[PDB]
Amino acid sequence: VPMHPFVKALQEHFTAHQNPEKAEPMARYMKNHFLFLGIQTPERRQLLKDIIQIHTLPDQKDFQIIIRELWDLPEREFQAAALDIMQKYKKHINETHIPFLEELIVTKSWWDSVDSIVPTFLGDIFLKHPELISAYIPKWIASDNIWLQRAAILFQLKYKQKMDEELLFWIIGQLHSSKEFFIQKAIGWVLREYAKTNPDVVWEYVQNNELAPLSKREAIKHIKQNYGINN
DNA sequence: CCCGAAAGTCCG
DNA sequence: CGGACTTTCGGG
């Protein structure tokens, strides 16, 4: 597939501002799973802005094409740009994009891309179409893929009073035995966050259900102050 | 300005 | 283990 001119312009502009000195620790921070150009977010967003000002944002007919082509580029900044761009097409995104979003989650996978995709884009879709949750979450949990499993945990992260508690706890129950850091941490996170909405329910859950020690400790990082730590 | 979050390192 | 600290980013 021939590169879209918008993507080529973006690649040229990013590459002209690369910083090899910054790229080295930036890559080590991601455990060297990715090449980096060495461009951090404030400049990366300005550089994207430059290209939009010159070329304009492509027609929505090319939205998914742009994202995939950026996803295929080796340096991590292009996936970060791709997520910035998807946000600009946000009002075109609906439930038919769930498989498209799945595929972004399982390719070039790490906590930075997956955390940017799940509580926002997928979170909004399932909030509007909760009947579709059961068409995906059971598969995600059963899959070998820890990022799909993390997606099942985190898609409700920002739901607050719209949280489905029964569902949340069922999902955690399914994954509480996982020895994977990124799963134990996501469980801790989502519980810590939901505790800001309903501390009593989270407290009761962690005191009476099995969790990895990391999950539990992270869950009660704040609300342990409200209940106390027994001798 | 601040704070809280993800990671990360380092230490007992 | 779990705590102290670090950077970057986003939101008040």
Q: Is the CB of A75 under 7 A from strand B?
A: no
Q: Is the CB of A221 under 7 A from strand B?
A: yes
Query: What gap in Å lies between CA A21 and CA A11, rounded to an integer?
Result: 19
What count of residues does chain A have? Answer: 231
Contact A157, A117 (CB under 8 A): no
Which of chain C's bases lie under 7 Å from a protein CB? 1-3, 8-10
**Secondary structure in 3-state letters for chain A:** CCCCHHHHHHHHHHHHCCCHHHHHHHHHHCCCCCECCCCCHHHHHHHHHHHHHHHCCCCHHHHHHHHHHHHHCCEHHHHHHHHHHHHHCHHHCCHHHHHHHHHHHHCCCCHHHHHHHHHHHHHHHHHHCHHHHHHCHHHHHHCCCHHHHHHHHHCCCCCHHHCCHHHHHHHHHHHCCCCCHHHHHHHHHHHHHHCCCCHHHHHHHHHHCCCCHHHHHHHCCCCHHHHCCCC
Fold of A1-231: Leucine-rich Repeat Variant (1.25.10)
Query: What gap in Å lies between CA A154 and CA A156, rounded to an integer?
Result: 5
- This entry's atomic model was obtained through X-ray
Q: Is the CB of A186 under 7 A from strand B?
A: yes
What are the residue boundaries of the structural domains of chain A, listed by start?
1-231
Contact A152, A137 (CB under 8 A): yes
- Closest nucleotide (C1' vs CA) to A28 is B8
